[PDB]
């Protein structure tokens, strides 16, 4: 015990030390109080990393655990005062979660010109990010470097689909904290946000088609705009629900909880709360199932672009049917949450 923690060289003679010893880790955990055994197992690997930079325990554990706390606090401080751990989240939030004004509306608008035989080679995907990033003036952090626009499927294709990968790469002593599975989960929620931007673009397109014809202010014109305002209310209020749950009430924690294993579990509990209140979990799957029908109908409403005036009225009526259908099944599932209580406010005020 007095070797590997203080000198920082692991010691074992006959294999009677329980702990034994790629990337850096080869250690394997597989009388005394077991409350200190795992502490020794982690307090050695830390010190090993700083080198590269009546029968009761009252007379033993008190001069022993007094140093474990010092090792732990030096370890946790090594993240913050050197790696700038607190800055990384409020920087990745800008781009990955698109918490950036005049960046998402500048990136998505360029993506949807192709969706197609463009966005295959890496000179147009390699140039499209730097045009969106200049339009916002939030970067010139080292997290505007390691930005990597890529994909898992090329564009070759009623159809509201769009998908993209966008990653922030990480080096080794941060890889154990912010992992490459966590960045992929940011990409997993990012796909849904980008798919919403496609709807905010299509309704904007039929809105811009009517914008240019105003000359005409007739009855048939205003009655068309009455359709648009209705669907846009739904889209903005559900976007406001996302901007509430995944972006306000979860964003309060894990910058007030941040003021060795525990940092990892705090991040993993943080994001686990973010996916739960955001209703992408399997408990709130049927709430999500209805949204794609509304999305399909908004795209259809853009497709008709009048001798199809009754057709557009019919699509608006189908939107109204499904929007009032959603409120009954989510009222039915009040008995199956505090955040779902907020959902009812967004969908209903007097929709019944």
């Amino acid at each position: 015990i007095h070797d590997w923690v203080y000198s920082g060289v692991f010691r074992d003679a006959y294999g009677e030390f329980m702990i034994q010893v790629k990337l850096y880790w080869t250690h394997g955990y597989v009388v005394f109080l077991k409350h200190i055994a795992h502490d020794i197992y982690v307090c050695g690997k830390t010190i090993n990393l700083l080198k590269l930079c009546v029968l009761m325990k009252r007379s033993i554990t008190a001069p022993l655990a007094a140093h474990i706390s010092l090792v732990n606090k030096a370890a946790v401080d090594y993240f913050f005062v050197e790696l700038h751990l607190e800055a990384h989240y409020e920087a990745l939030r800008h781009f990955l979660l698109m918490e950036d004004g005049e960046f998402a509306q500048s990136l998505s608008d360029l993506l949807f010109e192709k969706l197609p035989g463009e966005l295959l080679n890496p000179l147009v995907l390699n140039s499209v990010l730097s045009k969106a990033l200049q339009c916002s003036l939030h970067g010139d952090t080292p997290h505007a470097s390691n930005l990597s626009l890529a994909l898992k499927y090329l564009p070759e294709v009623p159809d509201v689909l769009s998908c993209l990968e966008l990653r922030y790469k990480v080096d080794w002593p941060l890889n154990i904290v912010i992992t490459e599975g966590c960045v992929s989960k940011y990409s997993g929620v990012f796909s849904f946000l980008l798919q919403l931007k496609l709807m905010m673009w299509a309704l904007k397109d039929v809105c811009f088609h009517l914008k240019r014809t105003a000359m005409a202010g007739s009855v048939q014109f205003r009655q068309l705009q009455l359709f648009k305002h209705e669907m846009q209310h739904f889209v903005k209020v559900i976007q406001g629900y996302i901007a509430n749950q995944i972006l306000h009430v979860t964003w309060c924690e894990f910058r007030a909880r941040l003021a060795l294993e525990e940092i990892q579990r705090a991040h993993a509990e943080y994001l686990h709360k973010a996916v739960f209140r955001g209703l992408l979990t399997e408990k709130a799957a049927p709430v999500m199932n209805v949204i794609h029908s509304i999305f399909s109908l908004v795209l259809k409403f853009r497709s008709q672009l009048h001798p199809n005036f009754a057709l557009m009225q019919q699509s608006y009526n189908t939107f109204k049917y499904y929007s009032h259908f959603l409120f009954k099944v989510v009222t039915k599932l009040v008995n199956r949450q505090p955040h779902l209580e907020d959902f009812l406010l967004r969908i209903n005020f007097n929709n019944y």
Binding site: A214, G217, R222, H229, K236, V237, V249, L345
Partner: protein, 420 residues
């Protein structure tokens, strides 16, 4: 993106100059344009991206017979902007004809600033309804911009005139200008001088320097309306995304404004929600229900209690609303602005589409109809007579505002599923 600001008339040039002083003091800006040692935020909405960050405001001043422009001149904030976009009666006909004769070179000033800009997104008109030199000239020139640029957005900051009627052609001037606001503008924010003077006599005992105080009020209004743009926020960083939620009908673009702290000489978000839901925090004076309400807030908030605030205000059912359709009250939040003194930390501002303004329109309709039946309050302008021999432009505007009043009252009905 890039929005070019228009200031015209005595009143409009006053609040425009005050608001530019507000943004110079607000951001890290010298009185010369120099970036200061405390300046980050988004600085390209009206700010010219110069090399040493001489954030030159996109401010085009155009009038004739300059009086208040001389008062703008003797100031260090005439060195803040001057890309040579500053240009040197009180009736609609006189201002209309004066705008007609010099429309070309001032529109060349407009075009030079337009191609000098990187993009164009909106025209913000600093104005007041029947603002003297602003009236007639502004309606004419607004028609020139709307004809010449149909792909842009128009927001008109103006106040409802209350001068205790003296010009007797003022309902005619406001009626024709209001016609142009209906057909050549997409958003009109009007405020009552009566209710603002009531709030001024309410919070303090000062009503005599009313021009100076009202400049502070509408400058707070406009800085709060653009704070989500000029400081890095999340949404309504376009004007159009802000405008779209308010408007179900492109002729109903007239909005009511309210401001939650009435004194400045904090607490939770549910409280300011309840405050703003009262009509005594409103700056503007049968049954009338709002079409859609949206609020902007800036201050020190609890990010989870805003959910709880909407939850309690909803289940209180502290409001009515309109029969035809699912709208909501809409929350929007941004930062409390740094580099100024921050007193009464929560300041909220509301934009609502209300049918109560149709009564105000009907007041001006009744005034115009009364003076029209009497027919002794046009004073027989020769410019008005050669411009219109029969004065049926006023008849057509009265038809337009009557159609809007009909749309307002049928929108009060649940039969706005049918035509209004």
């Amino acid at each position: 993106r890039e929005i070019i600001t228009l200031q015209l008339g005595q009143c409009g040039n006053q609040i425009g100059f005050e608001f530019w002083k507000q943004l110079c003091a607000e951001h890290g800006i010298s009185p010369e344009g120099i970036v200061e040692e405390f300046a980050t935020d988004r600085k390209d909405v009206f700010f010219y991206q110069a090399d040493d960050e001489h954030y030159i405001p996109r401010a085009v001043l155009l009038d004739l017979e300059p009086r208040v422009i001389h008062s703008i001149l003797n100031s260090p904030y005439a060195k803040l902007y001057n890309p040579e976009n500053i240009y040197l009666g009180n009736n609609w006909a006189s201002g209309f004809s004066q705008g007609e004769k010099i429309h070309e070179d001032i529109f060349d000033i407009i075009d030079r600033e337009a191609d000098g800009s990187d993009s164009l997104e909106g025209f913000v008109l600093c104005h007041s309804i029947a603002g003297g030199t602003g009236s007639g000239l502004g309606s004419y020139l607004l028609e020139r911009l709307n004809d010449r640029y149909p792909k842009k957005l128009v927001q008109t900051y103006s106040v409802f005139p209350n001068q205790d009627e003296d010009v007797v052609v003022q309902p005619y001037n406001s009626l024709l200008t209001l016609k142009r606001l209906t057909q050549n503008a997409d958003c009109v924010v009007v405020l009552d001088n009566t209710a603002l003077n009531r709030i001024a006599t309410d919070r303090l005992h000062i009503q005599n320097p009313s021009f100076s105080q009202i400049n502070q009020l509408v400058s707070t209004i406009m800085s709060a309306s653009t704070t989500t743009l000029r400081y890095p926020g999340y949404m309504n960083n376009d004007l159009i995304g802000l405008i779209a939620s308010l408007i179900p009908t492109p002729r109903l673009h007239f909005l009511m404004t309210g401001y939650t702290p009435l004194t400045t000489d904090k607490t939770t978000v549910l409280d300011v929600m309840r405050r703003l839901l009262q009509p005594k925090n409103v700056m503007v004076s049968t049954n009338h229900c709002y079409i859609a309400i949206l609020n902007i807030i800036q201050g020190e908030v609890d990010p989870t209690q805003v959910h709880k605030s909407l939850q309690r205000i909803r289940e209180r059912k502290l409001a009515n609303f309109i029969p035809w359709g699912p709208a909501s009250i809409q929350v929007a939040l941004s930062r409390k602005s740094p580099y100024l003194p921050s007193a009464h930390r929560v300041s909220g501002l509301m934009m609502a589409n209300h049918t109560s303004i149709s009564s105000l329109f009907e007041r001006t309709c009744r005034q115009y109809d009364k003076l029209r039946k009497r027919e002794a309050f046009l004073e027989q302008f020769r410019k008005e007579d050669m411009f219109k021999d029969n004065f049926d432009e006023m008849d057509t505007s009265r038809e337009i505002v009557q159609q809007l009043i009909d749309e307002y009252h049928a929108a009060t009905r649940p039969d706005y599923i049918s035509w209004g």
